[PDB]
Amino acid sequence: KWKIKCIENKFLNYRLTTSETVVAETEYGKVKGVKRLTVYDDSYYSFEGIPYAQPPVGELRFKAPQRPTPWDGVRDCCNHKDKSVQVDFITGKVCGSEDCLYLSVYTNNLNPETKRPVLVYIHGGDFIIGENHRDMYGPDYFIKKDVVLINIQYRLGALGFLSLNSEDLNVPGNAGLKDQVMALRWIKNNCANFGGNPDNITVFGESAGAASTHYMMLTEQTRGLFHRGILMSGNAICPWANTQCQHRAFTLAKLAGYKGEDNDKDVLEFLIKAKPQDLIKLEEKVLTLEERTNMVVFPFGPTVEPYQTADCVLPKHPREMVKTAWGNSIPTMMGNTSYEGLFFTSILKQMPMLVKELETCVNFVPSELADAERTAPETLEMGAKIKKAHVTGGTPTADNFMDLCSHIYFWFPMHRLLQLRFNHTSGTPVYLYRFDFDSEDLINPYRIMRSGRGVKGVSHADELSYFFWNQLAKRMPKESREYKTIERMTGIWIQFATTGNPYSNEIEGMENVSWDPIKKSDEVYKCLNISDELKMIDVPEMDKIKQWESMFEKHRDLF
Template identity: 45%
Template sequence: MKEALNVKLDGNSDHTPGDQRAYIGFRYRQHRRKTSEKLVVETVYGPVRGVKRISCWDDPYYSFERIPYAKPPVGELRFAEPQPPEPWKKIMNCTKEAEPPLQYDKIFNQLKGKEDCLYLNVYTTNAKPSTPKPVMIWIYGGGFELGGATKVIYSPDYFMRKDVVFVTFNYRVGALGFLSLKDPALKVPGNAGLKDQVMALKWVKNNIARFGGDPDNITVFGESAGGASTHYLMLTEQTRGLFHKAILMSGTVHMYWALTPDHDWAYRLAKKVGYTGVNDDAKVLEFLKKADGKAICRKGSNLLSAEEVKERLDICHGPRIEPYITDQCIIPKDPRLMARETWSNEIPLVLGGNSFEGLLLYPNVKRNMGILKELGDCAYLVPNDLNLDRNSEQCKEFGLRLKKEYFGDKEPTLFPYLNLLSYKVFWHGIHRTVLSRLKYASAPTYLYRFDFDSENFNHFRNLVCGKGVRGVCHADELTYMFNSMFGHHKDPGTKEYSTIQRMIGMWTQFAYNSDPNFAGIEPTMWRAVKKDNMPMKCMNISDEVTFIDLPEHESLKVWDSMYSEDKLI
């Protein structure tokens, strides 16, 4: 994941300036597409004023942005667990979105955002409907190091054609969101970014009825780190009763990058920023609280040693098992074990991924083709959570299984290697989550596979790979869900337009009644996965939608073979 986020666009030099121009143009269009009509809603903390906007399809809706759901995490609250916001009496102007959380953007090589970031946005077509609307809460991805609830990437236009209330929010990322210290007296156990998410969900539960939403019909969904975040929210007792169904897109807690190992990251970060003292939690925290936030973000984005890179570690500051329990604790133990007994085994779930997720890593591998010659017996590609000595015979034997599956008797080449990474980084985690649900959940689980390959509209692939590479990359489905700087709505009659309608139709139908089937995919029937039906069945979303055996099934069995059943799920 971290390698993927560290995308350099050299070799595609037109991308960065072009994307900057797209960003400016999109912000200008967004600014113009609002009216003078305002609406005031009284929240439990105070009144907020929104504005009526016009979507890209000319649908009017009300937009409430930059609503505080927690105190600003600054000063003494830097790294701390979130606190409820202070109430206010005067009408708060909520017609402009907040900046994203402070972060170092590796794609554009720049710092952006603010530490004062804990705000959310509510979009609704009718604040006083005759019947409360289903609520959909979006959680952005970005490897727990990037992202923000911004219309530049996640504009609600497509969802505003449906009868839902749509919510987005910022949560802290990087070291500012996930720093962890072992000393209980310091009250920084980690996972502050996930705790921000819980605080946002509580705000929605207590306030969304005032915007026309149904607090008893809330769907949480997210992509990549947002999908893994959503899964964590499904596992913790902190969220019981706060939502009622979920959608995990290319991200679950069963993916190795979704749980960060304890490698003394706080001390290593402090030294990078300029700390010269001893490795003492209290002194490290005192230094980091006073340090420049921008320096923390920039230096904290690259703490990995050469050996850790070789071990395929990706994220320094992300979710972790907390070293002690607090009132807001999210991850008290191995999330795989939490998934066995969680309350959310009783709520319906949609999950899946894209057919060639590994294209995300194309620029990194392309710049370092020597890595293919260094694969050897592929022992370093064996899953980290098996905790095997890389020089052991067992690890080497597992590596050779992978080598045979993806390369056969040939030398490793670029695209077969990227295909292997699709499984290692994403698909095996999706598969393990389905297996866990089949064993422990009583509610239905629906599996999908996004496979729509548009030459010009799969914008994330085009961004990271350049033109000429085909396949459905990680994050490509976002273009078909959000009007954004990367892609705008297509004309009716195109396959791209049909795919947008299908994605929004399935996701909102699931929000309506816990079943993703809707008229736009008939006569195909999307059925929940079954224990006695292998290979697993999935909804394949391509030029058409078809209900098929999961094409990745046979390769996934190779990955399964390395685990005992107790360790697999």
């Protein structure tokens, strides 16, 4: 009965609405926003449902986004628009709409042309769930400072990530990333109408939003569109962040009742006619046993596009794109939580047999090093290195499994990215943080997903509670450790967005911090560890990171 909780939150948001409205310009027409309160009695102007593309319906389904049609009059932006079609993470039922290509703009005062720092949040959700609704991403904490915060949506699932090899069909893939490109172009061209500085834009995101932010730093499509990036628990070279899905359109069509054969034209024609909820509901069945054994987790997502087009986002694997990426030359901050893999708590309680995967660890070997059968003696050798890093006793444990997950999915791809990126870049700084603040008094819905009630440890996504208001949040006393962490986390992100350096002597407990960026010559990474105190420390994960790297001793050119 999270349904009642959604109702109570809707009525809270009515009580936080004021009668004051304001009209702002966009390149396509005027928009009306509304002034809202927070539970802390701050206030901000809220513009939701600003279109940046034409609704991708009919023959626009699966295709790159088109510019929207301009309007006379004033478009109402005092309420949100639908999220992209997806399976509701709680109810299990399809929700959302194909008409989802919107962004929201928030700022405590509307002062056009006054060059406030702009922060752009790209949500996570594995490219299959998420939204910019304020029940998860309320701007209530950021608007305490004079920034412009923008939260985008983009197409999810098969509707965002279908990819077909046939050049004549112009469905090369990555429609959802092309949505992000269009939104970032809109932001550069329009943020000044909301008081934002088009010469000082920061893009940030968590989980798949971090992979997205990184993709937006890699692709030539966005060269020069923004000026700082923050990658929170992910990047574009994480193994979960891309997949070659060109063959899976036929499978999806067949699951949905398609009667034809495997050719892209006939498959596309069926998929264009299908109801969107039917396709999205069936996506969870698309992966094969062999794909799941090889730890492909999602059937549709960012892909290397099979041929070049004007709007192409990923012309090569992200590892190769790092070598020429424009975003290597902007200030960058990266980090993770102190127990990322706690995300898998509930999965391990449902299928305890997953721990048996740790006996040899062959399925965790990077796909570029493994054979498809996962039986080659070389693959077993490499699994043995993973097992040494994470199996503490005899029989592996669930905690060993969760520790391994922190590394395969977050820490090791971070390390690989840092080391690859050093071999390029103009010298621009990269700063590391580690979010290590544990509380059950201020939470967000991800804790429900992982059965995290009563569970100690700082899991994947727990930091979001200190950046965004959400419907499970509560007002915290000014003197509480949770309130102080809100101020610290938003404050550091705003400081970084403003100057490209995350340090400020005005943040409580940060005065005696010397936070240097990582150097090429560093053998041990240093990070700002954020707990009840702020302290620079050697990354505790370093030794296990180096053990993962040792898997590439015989394949250094692949590292």
